[PDB]
Design a protein around this ligand. Structure first.
Ligand SMILES: Nc1nc2ccn(CCCCc3ccc(C(=O)N[C@@H](CCC(=O)O)C(=O)O)c(F)c3)c2c(=O)[nH]1
Ligand SMILES: NCC(=O)N[C@@H]1O[C@H](COP(=O)([O-])[O-])[C@@H](O)[C@H]1O
Length: 200
């Protein structure tokens, strides 16, 4: 399966995906890295890995649909089969999400359905949970319907901050995101016709 990774920042998840997809048994190949922010470290990791990069600036488009539509053109150009959102901090429009339904994965730093949204770690610390984690899920129009592929629990330790908690969670992200990509790319996991996860 041909995979595009969309990023917005450091790209530690991108690096984990690169490392895994280069393994001989990987059913996925990363053929393009797309960032909405220039000069982000994720672009360097891609270039070090010899992966084509494309910066698409959301701030240069008349609206989201024209911005998403720009991304979709790159995806078609590279004949992409699966889209991995790895730190992509730009909400995608309904028609784009509709087109790539069942083919777009996202990593979220919480045990969904808990702590949806942009500051999951802050929410988890404010709430006082002692167990958090991360989630790889199919991207749906409303984040409340995205089917879950893999999760991993991560302990919240006394005195944790966003810095220390996010660091611990990212170690789990770097495990379940490559595993989830491998599950989808191999056809072992798919969005069944009923809309729920289907294990083949
Ligand atoms: N339809 C759908 N689309 C997308 C795109 C990524 N994802 C994966 C979920 C990612 C969690 C997330 C990410 C970003 C924001 C956010 O606030 N974005 C601002 C700009 C942010 C900035 O300035 O850094 C904006 O784009 O307006 C947020 F609220 C929650 C999804 C998804 O799950 N569904
Ligand atoms: N779902 C939105 C969200 O909170 N995304 C989070 O951004 C980070 C990017 O890390 P990276 O750029 O080092 O991979 C990840 O920890 C990911 O869970």
């Amino acid at each position: 399966a041909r995979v595009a990774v969309l990023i917005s920042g450091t790209g530690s998840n991108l690096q984990a995906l690169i490392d895994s997809t280069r393994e001989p048994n990987s059913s996925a190949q990363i053929d393009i890295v797309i960032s909405n922010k220039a000069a982000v470290a994720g672009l360097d990791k891609a270039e070090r890995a010899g992966i084509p990069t494309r910066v698409i600036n959301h701030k240069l488009y008349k609206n989201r649909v024209e911005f998403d539509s720009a991304i979709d053109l790159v995806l078609e150009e590279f004949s992409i089969d699966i889209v991995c959102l790895a730190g992509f901090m730009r909400i995608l429009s309904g028609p784009f999400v509709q087109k790539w339904n069942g083919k777009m994965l996202n990593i979220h730093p919480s045990l969904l359905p808990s702590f949806k949204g942009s500051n999951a770690h802050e929410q988890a610390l404010e709430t006082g949970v002692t167990v958090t984690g991360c989630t790889v899920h199919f991207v749906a129009e409303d984040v409340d319907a995205g089917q879950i592929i893999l999760q991993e629990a991560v302990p919240v330790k006394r005195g944790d901050t966003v810095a220390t908690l996010s660091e611990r969670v990212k170690l789990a992200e770097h495990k379940i995101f490559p595993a989830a990509l491998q599950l989808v790319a191999s056809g072992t996991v798919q969005l069944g016709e009923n809309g729920k996860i289907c294990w083949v």
